[PDB]
Each structure stands twice: as structure tokens, then as C-alpha cells.
Design a protein around this nucleic acid. Structure first.
Ligand SMILES: Nc1ncnc2c1ncn2[C@@H]1O[C@H](COP(=O)(O)OP(=O)(O)OP(=O)(O)O)[C@@H](O)[C@H]1O
Ligand SMILES: [Mg+2]
Ligand SMILES: [Zn+2]
Lengths: 202, 649
DNA sequence: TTTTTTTTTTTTTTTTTTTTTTTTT
DNA sequence: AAAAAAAAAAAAAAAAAAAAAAAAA
């Protein structure tokens, strides 16, 4: 859906191809920069499937990108500080292949603490073996596979949503005093939540 | 004077050439100011006085007084600028006839050019024109000596040949020597030749200016004989220069298209961004405030709320102690290393970054490899310079400054060994390729770390809930245990702080008084460089009794004991606190404050039960300069928290 | 005959992959 | 005892600096 959206895998991407690389221009004395997956997601999204499987040598780069939004390269006779303003949608399998509900999120996955720290949202999708949910899922899947082109009545076409997203991204909302007080109270309550235990501290 | 067929050819003619020459001379003489009568008078005076051999000329005034010359300028920069140099030389001689002995030449630099472009907007249309751009210097070579006025030496008849002025476009080829009429090889004659400094830099688009789906572009520039060393890598610079193209650049080589490389002949450089006098009065003026200690302790990382004790420790680390080596066989470091161990989300990295920002010769590195410079030394060919250099470890780079180490508990084995060596012996020993050397790194290490398991548990002593061996922790003078404990009042206050910061830094809108940061660093410089307190007034009786009591108490329980190095650290912190006040003699209150800080750290390093044991046993020491309100508020908060826990269980 | 552009060669370094080794359950 | 992560080996590719030879006029 999203333009400037780049999808990758766990171990299928190396460091250079995932962040950046440098080659020398074949026609002059200057050097050109091969843009890695992170860069192509600039002002977009990077979808890292099987994140937990990614090598540490690459996870350090992803952590750097999340930290300062930028990639610093000193290679092949050229230095550069390039911009990577990308959001990261990661998909990580729980350690052991199944999510264990009797542990904190820190233990259920093999992500380093710095990586998890700067993830704004963690969504846990446990496969509760409920019959109603299974019936609904089966109905939807079979309806999809029976009626391929139809059966999808989306109120807004993907092109319309793309245009609306591109227009709305330009807005820079303010924070009024009332909203500031509401944020303060909500944060107070959310911290009080952590006073049973939660999947991870707040 | 719009007339003719070609602008460059128009200036080429002798007539308009001399017309422009004399008009520019008259402009230099006559253009005075709105009120600064004859700015160029004092300009030339100062330049000659310091022997600067340069003249920065604003474009606005030149266009105002002589619009024709300003219009001609960008179209054919080479000829107009050469004429301006010729004019300014004789103008200077008229003002300073003797100065003719100095450089026999004057360069004219032009600034505030009206139209400013970006490296991505450069096109063939801009060839051979004065253009103003902005960018980050991404690489810069040494000050290479380039031939200026060569005198080749004929081999056959050993006759030196006349000066063949070197051109930036083509290499000079000598003819046949006038004497023996030989077209032989010839060789430079360095003793009789004269050169000019030649630096080559690369300027790339500022990342903050690049668009979303685009990559920064870069252009090569040449600085010549006076702009050299005016830039360093990482500088944001406005560069005005000639988009020169015709030197040798044409891909006539096979498997190549008729492309042309481009380099900007630099003509003016402006960096967009501390040895003063009479500021000693300023520093001394508030030095006698009698409460400056609180001011400075509150003037550290003003963007961080609370954590006052950590700020005090960082202030003491900044001002440092007094290194002393009795005889030459007992090396005692004057530094105050600090370790901030705490659960995440408590602004430890913020403190480290503030110290990076506020302290000169301060470098930042991380336990991970995400830092520009590593902790360990090595030797290699630098990737950008391609030159074989000894990359000294980060600690060495901060030889007399501050090394900030984030993720202190995620280092490598070799990184741990290197930090141990630096902290222990204050030097690094390298034997990597053939360099058997020992270079000293007298750095103050300020480290940040998280407890094992991501949460600090007071039921366990400090040394066991941190992924650091005892020898490493034993070399830190202050241990700050930052704990994130749920507290509604503090939570609300911090929420207000950060949300207000977010409000105030929106793009559209872009109990003492803390000192301004610039004055704070001036004070730090003066204190750290001039005042060297001596502890001739320390009460040995009090310190000895305190140490003996602490030994007895710590050994009375199964707790980490107090050792001599703790007394050493207390001495260093007392000297640092005296340095803050520039007393030049440690006073009883300085010693008491140092004892307070050292005991606070040592107590907080203990387990939960021993924490209260030593708090009650030494509450007198730990309460120095701690007014009644603070203790009463702490006790009330403890009681109300106990009530809350009883309520919600 | 004399220049010039290429040809090599001779070092050195750098990067990817694979393999080998070390640490943990 | 066996798997996961790290380190080292090793082989292939690139830069490049300089000396010598073949082709051109
Ligand atoms: N006392 C504080 N005052 C102001 N801002 C704070 C404070 N504590 C935390 N913050 C803010 O909360 C965020 C978290 O802080 P920060 O990113 O520096 O974490 P940290 O202590 O370095 O954690 P970690 O150990 O995970 O690296 C930042 O945006 C920081 O500005
Ligand atoms: Mg941190
Ligand atoms: Zn001769």
C-alpha cells in the first residue's frame, strides 16, 4: 500500500545492502551512494519480517537508524552523513516459536533491550484456541478464496487513501493546554497501572 | 556599461579592463559607510597589521556604489577578481608602502552574494560563474604545496629557467631553454621556485536540507593559499566560488562518455556557527556569590528535571581534582570518574550528551559499535584519506578531557581490557603492527549503564546487579544509582516538563538561577586551568575517625567494606569542590561536602538492609548542607508511599 | 628516431563467503 | 552432547604506483 515502503527479511539482508553502500562513479572522480533498504524507506516505512532472526551486526544499524534517524558512512574514500526518516514495522517470532503468557515481553522475544526500548508500540498476537474466533477466521478466509476480486468492499480505494495520507502528512498539529493537562493525567494513570505485573515496565 | 558582444571578452579588452580597475580603486577609496567612515580604511589597516593578505568585500555595498561592476562580477569572476586583486595591491601600497615586501599580492574575497543555490541545483548553465552554496565538509586533505612560479632547471646547460606561472587549469610545460636551446626533460628547482598552499575539500548538501526521496550531493572545491585550514570535516560552511570546469576534466578515456568533472575554485568561506580578557572579573564577580555551588549544580543539563545529586557529581567530575605523583613512583590520578547505573527511561544518556556538549575535549562513544571512534587503539589505512594512520583509542583522544561511555555494560572483551588499562595506569600500550609505544590517556570516564535484567533491585548490592567485574567498578569515584520508582507527584512534574518541551520546540514556534552555559564553560575553563587547591587545612582527626568508624561498621555486617581508595576519592572530590569556589585552599565545608557525596555513593552501593544500617549509623555525615525541608519532605513521601502501598495491596 | 599510451607487475588492502572455533542449554 | 553465535582463514576483487615495451607519427 504505502509508497516508499520497503520490505525485507531476517537473514536475507546484509549490513551494506540494508543500510547503504558506496561505489565510485565510472565517469568522473566523484563517488555515488547505493541506497540500502533503510534509505529507500526515507519518509516512508520499512517492514522487517522475522526481525528476531536478524543478525546483531545488522540490528546495530537498525538501532542506529531508530536512534538518530541517520546513517554515517566512512568507506571507499568518502564519508557521508545521510538521512533516514523511516518508521519500522517489525515482525518477530516469540522465542521457542510460541508466545509464553507467563513471562514479560523482555523474555518472550530475543530482541536486545535497546531495540525494544525505542519501539513505540508492541502488539502481541496470541493464538487463543477459541472456537468462535476460528469459525470467523475460516469464514473470512473461505469467502476470500471463493470470491477473489469481489468480497472486498473497501470504502476508500488505495489510491484515495494514498492521496489523503500524502496530504495529511504535511499537517503539524499543535498541543493545546487542555490536551497537555489531559496528557499529564493519562500518563499519571498509565504509570499507576504498573504499581498485577504488566508485560513490560512503563 | 552594457555594450559589446561578450561579457568575458568585454572585460578582456584593455580599455574596459583599466576602466574597471580605476573605478574599483575609486570605490575602495570612496565608499565609506552609512556611519562607519571608510570601512575599507580600517579593514586594510588591520589586514596589513596582522599580515592577512586578504580583503573580504561585501557584495551589497559594491552593487550599490558600482552596479556595473557587481553585474560584471558573477558573469566572468576570474577577470574581475584578478583586476580587483591588482587594484587592491596598489591601494594597500598607497596606504602601506612598506607592506609591498609582504606577499607581493592581495586576494579579494566576496561575501553575501545575493543568489544562493544548492549542490543539487548546479547545472551546466552555471559553468564559469561566481556561485554561492552551502554544505557540510565531508572530506579535506592536507595542506599540499602546489607550484606557483616554477623555475625549471635545464639539465644539459645547468641554466635555471625563468618563472613560468603555474595555472590551475593546465600543468606548465617548459619550452627549450634560451641558452642551449634544448627541449630536454627539465626538473623543478625547489630552492628558487615559490609555491602556494593547496587544499582540496568536498562539500555535501546539509542533511537537514535534503528532501525526502533524494540523496545528498557533493562537489569538490579547491582552497588556495589563504583559505586553507579554514574548514574541518563536519563544518557547515557557506562557500562562494567559481564553478570551474576546464582544467583537464573530460572523460576521453575509453569506456567513457564526453562528460566533464566540475570543481569549485573557492574564493570565500564562511563557517556558520576562547581566550578572552576581563572575563576573569566576571568569573570572580560571581565566584564570591557565596552560593555559587548551588547555582552551578543546578546549571548542569537544564533540560533534565531532578537528579540533583547526579548533577552535583557531574559538576565535581567536570571541575576535576588535582593529579599528584609524590616523587615519581606513586601516580595518583586527579580525575573523578563517574558511573551512572540505572533502569532505562531516566535520562542517563541525556546527562552524557550534555557533558559532551558543554566540556571541551569531550568525546562520546558507546559500548556498541554505533560510535564513530572505538575504545581500543589500532593502525590502519583511513577509509577516506587512504593513508596509513595510528587510530588511537577514544580514551587517548580525550587525553586531558572527558570520555563519555554509553552502554558501559555491553562492551567487548578487548574494550573492557582497554578501559581497564586506561582507568588503572592512565595510558595505553600499543604493539599492533610494529609500533611498540605507550601513549598516555589521562581522561575522566563518565559512563552510563543499565542493571542486569533491565531493572535495579535494591535487595542486591550494586556490584552484583551490574554486568561489570569488581576491578572495573573499583576505579570509579562516584556511583549514581538512578532508580525509576513510581511516584505520582514526580511523574506529573516530569510529564509537564517534557510535554512543555515538546510544545515549545514545535516547528511553528521555533532555588537559584542557573548560570548561562557559555559563562558556565568559561568558569570551568578558568577554574580548571588556574586554581589548584591545596589541602593544608583538612582535619586529619575527623577524616581518620570517620574512616575507622566506617571500616568497623562495614565489617560488622556482611557488606562491601570501605577502603583507602574511598579516602582518595573523598580527597579528590573535596579538591574539586574547592576548585568550583576557587578557594585555593580546601575548607572544612568542602571536606564535609565531599564526605557527603562519597558516603552517599558508598551507601547506595550497599544492599537494602545495609542501606538503612549505614543511613542511620552515619545520618549526621549524610545530612551535611541538607536543610530540614528536604529531609522532612523525604520522610513524608516515604510515609505516604507506605500508606499508598497498604491501600492498594 | 622519439614520444606516448598502454601493459604489466608487484604490493597492498578490502570484502564476501566459508569454515573453524567458542560458549551455552 | 549438541546447537548458536563469534572469530578466524582464506580466496577473490579493487586501488594504485611505478617501470617497461609497442604503436604512432
Ligand atoms: N529527568 C528527566 N528530565 C527530562 N526528560 C527526561 C527525564 N528522564 C527522562 N526524560 C526523557 O525521557 C526520554 C527517555 O530518556 P533517554 O532516552 O535519555 O533514556 P536513557 O536513560 O538513556 O535510557 P537507556 O538506558 O534505555 O538508554 C527522553 O526523551 C528524555 O528526554
Ligand atoms: Mg541510554
Ligand atoms: Zn639548456
Amino acid at each position: 500500500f504505502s509508497p516508499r515502503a520497503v520490505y525485507t527479511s531476517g537473514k536475507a539482508s546484509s549490513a551494506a545492502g540494508l543500510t547503504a553502500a558506496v561505489v565510485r562513479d565510472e565517469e568522473s572522480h566523484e563517488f555515488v551512494i547505493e541506497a540500502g533498504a533503510l534509505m529507500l524507506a526515507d519518509n516512508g516505512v520499512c517492514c522487517i519480517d522475522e526481525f528476531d532472526k536478524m543478525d546483531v551486526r545488522d540490528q546495530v544499524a537498525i538501532h542506529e537508524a531508530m536512534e538518530q534517524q541517520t546513517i554515517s558512512i566512512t568507506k571507499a574514500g568518502v564519508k557521508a552523513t545521510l538521512n533516514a526518516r523511516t518508521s519500522i514495522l517489525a515482525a518477530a517470532n516469540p522465542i521457542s516459536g510460541h508466545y509464553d503468557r507467563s513471562k514479560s515481553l523482555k523474555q518472550n522475544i530475543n530482541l536486545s533491550a535497546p531495540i525494544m526500548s525505542r519501539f513505540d508500540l508492541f502488539f502481541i498476537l496470541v493464538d487463543e484456541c477459541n472456537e468462535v474466533t476460528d469459525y470467523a477466521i475460516a469464514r473470512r478466509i473461505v469467502d476470500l478464496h471463493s470470491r477473489i476480486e469481489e468480497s472486498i468492499d473497501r470504502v476508500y480505494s488505495l489510491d484515495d487513501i494514498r492521496r489523503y495520507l500524502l496530504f495529511a502528512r504535511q499537517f503539524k498539529p499543535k498541543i493545546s493546554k487542555e490536551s497537555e493537562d489531559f496528557i499529564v493525567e493519562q500518563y499519571k494513570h498509565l504509570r499507576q497501572r504498573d504499581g498485577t505485573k504488566s508485560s513490560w515496565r512503563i | 556599461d552594457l555594450k559589446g558582444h561578450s561579457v568575458r571578452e568585454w572585460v578582456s579588452m584593455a580599455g574596459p579592463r583599466l576602466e574597471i580597475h580605476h573605478r574599483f580603486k575609486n570605490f575602495l577609496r570612496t565608499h565609506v559607510d552609512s556611519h562607519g567612515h571608510n570601512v575599507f580604511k580600517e579593514r586594510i589597516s588591520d589586514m596589513c597589521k596582522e599580515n592577512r593578505e586578504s580583503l573580504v568585500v561585501n557584495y551589497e555595498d559594491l552593487a550599490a556604489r558600482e552596479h556595473v561592476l557587481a553585474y560584471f562580477l558573477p558573469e566572468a569572476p576570474a577577470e574581475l577578481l584578478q583586476i580587483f586583486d591588482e587594484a587592491a595591491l596598489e591601494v594597500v601600497l598607497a596606504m602601506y608602502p612598506k607592506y609591498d615586501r609582504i606577499t607581493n599580492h592581495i586576494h579579494v574575497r566576496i561575501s553575501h552574494l545575493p543568489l544562493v543555490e544548492e549542490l543539487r541545483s548546479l547545472r551546466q548553465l552555471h559553468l564559469n560563474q561566481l556561485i554561492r552554496t552551502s554544505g557540510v565538509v565531508t572530506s579535506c586533505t592536507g595542506v599540499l604545496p602546489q607550484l606557483s612560479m616554477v623555475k625549471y632547471n635545464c639539465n644539459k646547460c645547468n641554466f635555471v629557467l625563468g618563472p613560468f606561472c603555474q595555472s590551475q587549469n593546465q600543468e606548465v610545460k617548459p619550452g627549450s631553454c634560451p641558452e642551449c636551446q634544448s627541449a630536454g626533460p627539465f626538473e623543478v628547482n625547489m630552492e628558487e621556485t615559490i609555491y602556494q598552499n593547496y587544499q582540496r575539500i568536498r562539500i555535501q548538501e546539509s542533511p537537514g536540507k535534503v528532501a525526502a526521496g533524494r540523496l545528498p550531493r557533493s562537489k569538490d572545491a579547491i582552497l588556495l593559499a589563504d583559505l586553507v585550514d579554514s574548514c574541518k570535516p563536519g563544518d557547515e560552511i557557506e562557500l562562494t566560488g567559481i564553478y570551474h570546469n576546464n582544467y583537464d576534466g573530460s572523460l576521453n578515456t575509453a569506456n567513457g562518455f564526453p562528460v566533464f568533472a566540475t570543481v569549485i575554485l573557492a574564493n570565500h568561506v564562511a563557517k556558520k556557527d576562547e581566550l578572552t580578557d576581563e572575563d576573569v572579573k566576571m568569573i570572580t564577580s560571581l565566584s564570591k556569590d557565596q552560593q555559587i555551588g548551588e547555582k552551578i549544580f543546578a546549571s548542569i543539563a537544564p533540560s533534565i528535571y531532578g537528579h540533583e545529586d547526579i548533577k552535583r557529581g557531574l559538576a565535581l567530575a567536570l571541575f576535576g581534582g588535582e593529579p599528584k605523583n609524590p616523587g615519581g613512583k606513586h601516580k595518583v590520578r586527579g580525575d573523578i570518574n563517574v558511573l551512572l547505573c540505572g533502569d532505562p527511561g531516566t535520562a542517563k544518556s541525556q546527562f552524557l550528551k550534555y557533558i559532551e556538549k558543554v566540556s571541551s575535549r569531550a568525546i562520546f562513544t558507546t559500548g556498541q559499535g554505533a560510535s564513530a571512534v572505538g575504545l581500543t587503539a589500532y593502525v590502519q589505512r583511513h577509509p577516506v584519506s587512504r593513508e596509513w594512520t595510528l587510530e588511537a583509542g577514544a580514551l587517548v583522544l580525550a587525553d586531558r578531557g572527558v570520555c563519555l561511555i554509553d552502554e558501559f555494560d555491553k562492551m567487548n572483551d578487548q574494550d573492557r581490557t582497554s578501559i581497564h588499562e586506561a582507568m588503572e595506569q592512565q595510558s595505553i600500550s600499543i604493539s599492533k603492527a610494529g609500533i611498540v609505544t605507550s601513549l598516555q590517556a589521562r581522561c575522566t570516564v563518565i559512563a552510563a549503564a543499565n542493571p542486569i535484567g533491565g531493572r535495579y533491585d535494591p535487595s542486591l548490592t550494586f556490584s552484583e546487579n551490574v554486568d561489570l567485574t569488581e576491578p572495573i567498578i573499583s576505579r570509579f569515584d562516584i556511583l549514581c544509582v538512578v532508580r525509576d520508582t513510581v511516584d505520582p507527584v514526580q511523574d506529573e512534574m516530569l510529564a509537564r516538563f517534557v510535554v512543555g518541551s515538546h510544545v515549545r520546540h514545535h516547528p511553528s514556534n521555533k532555588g537559584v538561577e542557573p548560570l548561562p552555559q557559555e559563562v558556565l564553560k568559561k568558569y570551568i575553563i578558568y577554574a580548571k586551568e588556574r586554581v589548584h587547591p591545596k589541602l593544608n587545612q583538612m582535619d586529619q582527626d575527623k577524616v581518620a575517625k570517620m574512616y575507622s568508624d566506617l571500616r568497623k561498621e562495614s565489617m560488622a555486617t556482611g557488606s562491601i567494606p570501605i577502603t583507602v581508595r574511598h579516602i582518595e576519592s573523598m580527597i579528590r572530590m573535596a579538591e574539586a569542590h574547592a576548585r568550583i569556589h576557587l578557594r585555593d585552599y580546601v575548607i572544612e565545608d568542602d571536606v564535609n561536602m565531599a564526605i557527603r557525596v562519597m558516603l552517599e555513593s558508598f551507601i547506595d552501593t550497599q544492599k537494602f538492609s545495609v542501606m538503612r544500617s549505614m543511613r542511620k549509623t552515619f545520618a549526621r555525615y549524610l545530612s551535611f548542607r541538607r536543610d530540614n525541608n528536604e529531609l522532612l519532605l523525604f520522610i513524608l513521601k516515604q510515609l505516604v508511599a507506605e500508606q499508598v502501598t497498604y491501600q492498594r495491596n
